[PDB]
Write a protein that binds this ligand. Sequence first.
Ligand SMILES: c1ccc(-c2ccccc2)cc1
Ligand SMILES: c1ccc(-c2ccccc2)cc1
Ligand SMILES: c1ccc(-c2ccccc2)cc1
Ligand code: FES
Ligand code: FES
Ligand code: FES
Ligand SMILES: [Fe+2]
Ligand SMILES: [Fe+2]
Ligand SMILES: [Fe+2]
Lengths: 440, 440, 440, 186, 186, 186
Amino acid sequence: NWTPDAIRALVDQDNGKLDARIYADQDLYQLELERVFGRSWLMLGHETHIPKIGDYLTTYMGEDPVIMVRQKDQSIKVFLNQCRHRGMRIVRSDGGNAKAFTCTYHGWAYDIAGNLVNVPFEKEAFCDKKEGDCGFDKADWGPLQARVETYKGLVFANWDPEAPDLKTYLSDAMPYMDVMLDRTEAGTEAIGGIQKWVIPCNWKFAAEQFCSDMYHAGTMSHLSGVLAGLPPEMDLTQIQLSKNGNQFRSAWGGHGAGWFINDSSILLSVVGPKITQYWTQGPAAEKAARRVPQLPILDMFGQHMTVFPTCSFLPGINTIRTWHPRGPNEVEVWAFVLVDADAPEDIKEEFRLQNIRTFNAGGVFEQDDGENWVEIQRVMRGHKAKSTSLCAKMGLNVPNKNNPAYPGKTAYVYAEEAARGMYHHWSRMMSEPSWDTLKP
Amino acid sequence: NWTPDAIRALVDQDNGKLDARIYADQDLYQLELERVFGRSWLMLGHETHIPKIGDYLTTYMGEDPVIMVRQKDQSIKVFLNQCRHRGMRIVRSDGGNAKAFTCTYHGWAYDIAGNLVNVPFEKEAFCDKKEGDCGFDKADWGPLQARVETYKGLVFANWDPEAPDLKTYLSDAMPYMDVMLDRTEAGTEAIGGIQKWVIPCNWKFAAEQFCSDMYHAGTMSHLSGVLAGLPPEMDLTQIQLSKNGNQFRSAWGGHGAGWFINDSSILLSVVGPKITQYWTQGPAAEKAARRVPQLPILDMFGQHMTVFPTCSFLPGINTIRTWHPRGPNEVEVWAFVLVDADAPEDIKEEFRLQNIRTFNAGGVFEQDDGENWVEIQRVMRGHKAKSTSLCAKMGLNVPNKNNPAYPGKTAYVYAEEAARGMYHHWSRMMSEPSWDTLKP
Amino acid sequence: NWTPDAIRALVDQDNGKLDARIYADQDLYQLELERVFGRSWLMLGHETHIPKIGDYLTTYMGEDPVIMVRQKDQSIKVFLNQCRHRGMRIVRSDGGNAKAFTCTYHGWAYDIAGNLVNVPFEKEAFCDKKEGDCGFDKADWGPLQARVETYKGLVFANWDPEAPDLKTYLSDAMPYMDVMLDRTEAGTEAIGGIQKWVIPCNWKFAAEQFCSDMYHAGTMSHLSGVLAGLPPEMDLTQIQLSKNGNQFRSAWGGHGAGWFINDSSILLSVVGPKITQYWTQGPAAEKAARRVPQLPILDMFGQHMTVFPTCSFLPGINTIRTWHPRGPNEVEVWAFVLVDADAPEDIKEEFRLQNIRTFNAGGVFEQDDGENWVEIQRVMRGHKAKSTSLCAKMGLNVPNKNNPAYPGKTAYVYAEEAARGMYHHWSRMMSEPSWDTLKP
Amino acid sequence: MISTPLSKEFEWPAKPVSLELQHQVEQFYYREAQLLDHHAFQAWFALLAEDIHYWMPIRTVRTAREQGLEYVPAGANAHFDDTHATMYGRIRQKTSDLNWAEDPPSRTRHLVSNVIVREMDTPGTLEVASAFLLYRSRLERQVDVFAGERRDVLRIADNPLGFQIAKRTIILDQSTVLANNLSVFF
Amino acid sequence: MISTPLSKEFEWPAKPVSLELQHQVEQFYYREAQLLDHHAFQAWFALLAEDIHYWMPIRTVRTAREQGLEYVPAGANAHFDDTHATMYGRIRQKTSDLNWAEDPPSRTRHLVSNVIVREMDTPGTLEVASAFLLYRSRLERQVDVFAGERRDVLRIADNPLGFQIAKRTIILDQSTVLANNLSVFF
Amino acid sequence: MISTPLSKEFEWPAKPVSLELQHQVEQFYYREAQLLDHHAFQAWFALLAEDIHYWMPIRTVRTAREQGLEYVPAGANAHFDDTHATMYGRIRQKTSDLNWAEDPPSRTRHLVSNVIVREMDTPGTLEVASAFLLYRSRLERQVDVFAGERRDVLRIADNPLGFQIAKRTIILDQSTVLANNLSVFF
Ligand SMILES: c1ccc(-c2ccccc2)cc1
Ligand SMILES: c1ccc(-c2ccccc2)cc1
Ligand SMILES: c1ccc(-c2ccccc2)cc1
Ligand code: FES
Ligand code: FES
Ligand code: FES
Ligand SMILES: [Fe+2]
Ligand SMILES: [Fe+2]
Ligand SMILES: [Fe+2]
């Protein structure tokens, strides 16, 4: 039994300390399902995954399987992939088009809105003279509905009716999202194929890394990944390093972003010269600069971002993923690639191939990331190692690291201000039962 | 920590509602081992599995491994397959004949009654001058004995000395059992070979299905199974359906049975024309009608039954099984086939081959059953899905569905009266600590 | 929640009874990690595993991964294999030589003493003008250090600063250790290669067996192992048995040893004639007798020993291992072979080959040991089997079984006095929070 | 020898068969595996002879003195015990799109190795022993691994594959079936 | 047939290839497996032709009516989609001693069986289907098992092994990748 | 080459061996597997030469600079290190009916593939590399999977199988042994 005071003690943003129990404790994970995943806005996919009426995608909200389906009025509804009769999975496919969703156990059929419309033998077994005259009404037995909101292509969902709306939830982080999402009036589109793989680590390691951790990329985590993109005549001794940049911590919510400034080296290593040129020079880059006027986007390179708790992406590379939790010791990565809808075909193709090369289950960057996370989780199995006080002091009390060209709280590119913000908001959601105090 | 009031709230038979937590909660499962499996009559096998003196079968009572062995006086004893010294499994074989059971660790030998009869070095190490003079007596260190009762071939066992006798425990359900068990004065016999397989689902899904769920078979669960038995010139559009029948709920105990009336279609699809003829017409069918006078057995077809908690069978098809629990998320099915001992050899052979075809780990019916159960359990892993209020309203408050030709409480063939009875008795066993109130 | 009184009730040394819950209860295991493994002296390896400066071995203290490393001053330090930043495993190799240990995630480098010496971008990100002026000091962020003590070659470690020193902890058991460890002034050396394998059983079964259980070897556990060493013309009917010997229980700590007297049969079966001759006759045997004057070592054969909780060895065969716990239902055996450093090369080779033959993952003796333990653990999964009262009465109240030629408390070779002592001390460590009462 | 106990090793001929025959049998099995692993159930069924007996006995756990009782004998309960007619029904189920155990369908791989051929007295008829590893995965994460031995009677046939399966006995290296079903062909 | 749907069985020739050719293809694959299983990545890379296309599509879970959507098509997201240049980079990573996913290196075993060869119209060019079982273990206890099918285009070459891989398409018998990465070559 | 480091790939000959020899070696291995998988331990032991050395080294987890220390060397601790005499004892144990680790006996399958043969200078003597998948199941639910490589020295012999095993070195693709024992032969 965890008390609000005991939970708050696990994270100390004022002293930059983290209790290692947050990553492995089973009781804390169960509280995460209720107090974090049960009332946060979670990314399910993109609008282009379900463009036509009846199109659906099966995905997750935490460990709960959900159906994301396009309606007749072009709206999107999200409901639990669970039959109200005995709990059978209603939809067993990854996606497609449907006029109805039928349960294979007893044949209970639901419409695309999630309403129970057909119950076999209702006249013979469920009622006497007319439907509903014996206490059974089909309107009472539909699967749990989630609140649905879209932000510039991305579909978010939330169970909690008391939770704030998506935009309020996103705080001052929206311009940083727009660097990838609002570059053109044509919007973005998802390249076909969501890659799914299983990493035995806590979701917070992955969420924090994309939130606040450029430090790993600028050190030794990706030396071999950078070398993979270098020509035969070039090696790691010839390439510089990169030390100029900033990071962002959201005013509320635990969102975070980090980027390098005036140096395309880290982007060039991942995406190559063609995308780097598209990202910086020409009509498309000029249009994007006008559409995101709150940020000097043309000077930003190799950006990382996490929308709390589990929506992570890399503007410029354009990989985007949801970390689906599978206990305190496991996560499922559901990743896809976004491109500008009006981008030239050779640019879209370049985005496609460079993503597979780099940020992919078998990618030259991604494989080294997971290996770090899996080993952390394995060490956490130890009794002394699970209660260790971890260092989150990076950048704390360090003056003159902010950047006035960027909105909100900023720090150095190599810092854990956004990380401290992520874990502070985590502790807030875990300790405060009501939105009366939790809301911004 | 679960309170009796909190446990009773999980099942509402008056409103037809079930809390999904009953199928996955680990703490509730541990209480099931003590309050349900620890004091219920559980089926271990048939008398024909152990016909001769010394013949034994290793099986389970819940998760406890037990030895079922024929005694010198032709009685049957059941005791824990655990050595009292350090807990080693005494018998490592599935079955056979023995004069003694010897532990491989330190050589402690037990007789077929479960008495410790030989302790190596007892004279040198355990006593001074005479056996027992230093506090060690072999009579004190025998494995835990279970109460043993047989009902017309089937062997049942119960740990609890305070529990009611088998026949009292069976309430008014015995005639429904006799449809399969008491057709002839020759009794039944088990065809050699107990099929064992592992299904990752809760035991209650399987127990309920055989207790009260004809609904799944009459809908879409077994459309492909029915098609498997149809000749090339016939398809599913030509075959009717079946809508006439009843189900039975026991006065006490949570036992249940369901059957179709005056329609052999569902039986014919599973067992074929030869068995259907044997089941309905001729001297054998006439004899069975005389031996079970409380039921119009000749008009009953495709019967399903569960003797609470885990003894399930299908009279007519004659598959019978115990669902051995393996946590809240897993079960082991131990199934065998029963035939009338005096049945003609071609009938016994037909029963054998039709069972393998249909109700078997690889059978055309059974495989679709498991697939439903596994998917329900997988969805239950979600936080919202595990606490869902499930619909058990089928047939509740629906008038004129009983049948006066059958003893006890009856409802429509497509109903969940027997299901509500099963879960109501489940909640009773889980909430009432004493047999002073639990007993009928 | 376990109370000190409830824990003490699990072990009754006065009546020779053990509660089976000690071997499988998850809550009791978590208390073992804190109250037993968190403050006991645990064997990590031998000094010969790390002979040179910078040489390291990665091993375990319970479930905590640790680095055992030789220092510049020839001392040995032991610290947690966990980076203080985000918990990444610092050393991923089994062993070798290092000048520094570097974390692969963010490049935090530690010296061989476990001090944090290099933090990438410390000047740019962690401080303002000088290192440490913003609250971040490298001296604050080193991995947890363990107390290190060696006993005649063997390296022991303990987390608890309040715990007694190694020699005080070893009570009156040291002479029994010297039978293997102090035979020569040259000391012992470890043959290259630590064999690691996984047994799904509780650590206490293995620890007790080597502590007090000659009974299994003298009965039927190793009949096939003995036959493996017999020539074609010989079988088990021709070989005697062995019934003369004693066992030892430590005054404090739960340490135990057992041996046969004046009979080399059990040793000859395992190690052969060449080692038996070396162990008993000649200058080496004569030297050993002088060096261990508190014991008649030349009359001792087939000795087994456990240094509580998990250090087990067999003097004469010279197999030695640590049982690393992996939950209540699993253990990892880390075994190696010790030889006298000055022993002739043909003797060292004989020790090497006979060990692989016998006490090894694939050895003729070891394989039958594990099979017993795995089956005990599997039965313990049952509800009735997990709470069984087990017999530890062997030798209790049995008079005239001691031997005055041996120091401390002694009993018959076939007895559980040392076993009762092991479990009594186990219950003491589990129920007493302070060393103020626990210390000898 | 057709009636060799399944507990006993296969009765291989004095000398191994010709290179040509070994090649033809192996290639047939590889083609058979291709059909199953790509859900060509109708094409696979065409390879089963009219007098096919498809049988997979139950294996039990026995100690030393009762090892002759390891296999549940013919004429008793089994995992599979099938004729051409019953296998036809199984195929009808598999291709119906109503077989919920196989809709969505399983992803399978039939690894075929250790092929030992024996020429029987009837011209064109062969007795063949082989080892198999059947990997089965379905839906999101379910994985079932099957291993064992197949003992077949094969006849030369005028079909494109050149052979028909007259008899198949499957030794499964399991006692308790560890998968939730046996909804795949061996 | 190069463009055969991966859901459909391999288009084997009317009659199986010669004994000699079957032997040469199998022996090449065994030698290829030896190089990978012993971390001879530079030697293995030499077997890849200059125009190599190394491709592993994503597999999805689909019901009856949308089974044609099982495989994520070419020109979309994939597990692998590689040329000679991108594979060169992968090899550079593997031999750098900075590839943390493979340092310490994985212990692998590439089991190669069910080899079916088809002779293409271009002399010396072959289309080959084979089944694989890739066992991968690393560090203390990690074990990942991969199973599936490879469809290759092989060309005769003047190298010691006699062949070069011109094209490789990998069918993996998984939808969701059950391993933490795909840091091994197929 | 007999003394090739186990970390390094097998030294295959310039050109693959004859079809006939490949067939004879493979068929021998299939017959060897049949004997083990059907617990014919006395018959299997007859295949071991009088000068047999049966050896399985311990594998360790090493980083880049100390990869030469992966294998625990000869003349040190090992999983197996056996002669004809010690193997005889192992067989005596296995057939005693008192070997509790193998009574009840394990259900095994030795999958043999990737067979590469090299003809040595001594007539009738061959060095052979092969990959294996050893599936082991026992009692109710225990399953252990072993994968790796065997490097054998085989001699032609006047026995019915035609060969005897003169040397066997087993590469096991594990560092920490994941099974509770190694109570099966490789
Ligand atoms: C988390 C994930 C990826 C990156 C990243 C790596 C290289 C280049 C650009 C961003 C930073 C944090
Ligand atoms: C549970 C299990 C099987 C059946 C059943 C299915 C078809 C025909 C007869 C009974 C009904 C409930
Ligand atoms: C525990 C482990 C091994 C032995 C042992 C067995 C045979 C010969 C000598 C000692 C006794 C207890
Ligand atoms: S479970 Fe969906 S209809 Fe019964
Ligand atoms: S455990 Fe059965 S005799 Fe010791
Ligand atoms: S985890 Fe070791 S440096 Fe960050
Ligand atoms: Fe990264
Ligand atoms: Fe059913
Ligand atoms: Fe032992």
